[model samples]
Target: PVKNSWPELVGTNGDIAAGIIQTENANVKAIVVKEGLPITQDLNFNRVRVFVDENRVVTQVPAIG
Candidate 1:
């Protein structure tokens, strides 16, 4: 089964969180979205959006959309 959400990733390094997500689900590509950064409005199933703070730490639970 594929892991869909990562609550533990919150407050962790964004890059590492993305790496772990990609490792857990080969079908999805993880992308880190920095705080205050502009992102596309489209939803993507092949992606796991990791929202991170200015310190490069994840601020929210990453989930497949």
Candidate 2:
């Protein structure tokens, strides 16, 4: 079976969150994880916020909305 895919992140105007890597000078971009989902019944996942740039590089500090 295939796993569920998360929804695409969007801006307030409903635009996709796309940008180049700010820290690594890469073209890849992504958003930071503020809240994580529950994987197990007794365990809570820790959110590791990340925003990859076009080159797939991440930032040092996690971004929050």
Candidate 3:
């Protein structure tokens, strides 16, 4: 699922709250976890994966499609 519609993620170093806001805005099936960034993951653009850091900040939104 190559997406042409989604928020920019690289700079959203905010907490899971803002992340979920973006995720909800994306309107996809989101996966939220208090973990590190995914490794060349996210098999579809239709899925919202919020990688939360130790401080609850969003680390990365990977692209796998």
Candidate 4:
């Protein structure tokens, strides 16, 4: 449950570009791009350093004595 905000980009395509850039999913990483520039040119999905959602969340199993 993280929240993010930023100054609006400039130009006619800025909003749309921002939307495309802001999109995040369980498959996407949470490090660089998510923290820095929203532009695709500044970040690469391949370099994704961390998982953003519960897709990789681990549940504890009952311990046996």
Whose lDDT is greatest here? 1
Clashing pairs in 4: none
Ranked by TM-score from best down, the candidates are 1, 3, 2, 4
Across 17-50, the per-residue lDDT of candidate 4 in tens digits comes to 3343346333332232222223345545423332
Distance (Å) between predicted and true CA of 43, model 3? 2.0
Q: What TM-score would every model get versus the actual structure?
A: 0.85, 0.23, 0.41, 0.19
lDDT of 1 by residue, 1-65 (tens): 77788998899999999999999888999989987667678888898989999888998889988
TM-score of 3: 0.41
Location of the lowest summed lDDT over 10 successive residues in candidate 1:
34-43
Number of the candidate with higher lDDT, 2 or 4: 2
Stretches of candidate 4 exceeding 4 Å from the true structure: 1-12, 24-65
Cα lDDT of model 2 by residue, 1-65, tens digit: 32111233322211123232233323223444323432345421222235444444332333322
Model 2 residue runs over 4 Å out of place are 1-45, 63-65
Error of 3 at 48 (Å): 1.2
| lDDT rank order | 1, 3, 2, 4
Q: Taking the candidates one at a time, how many backbone clashes does each contain?
A: 0, 15, 0, 0
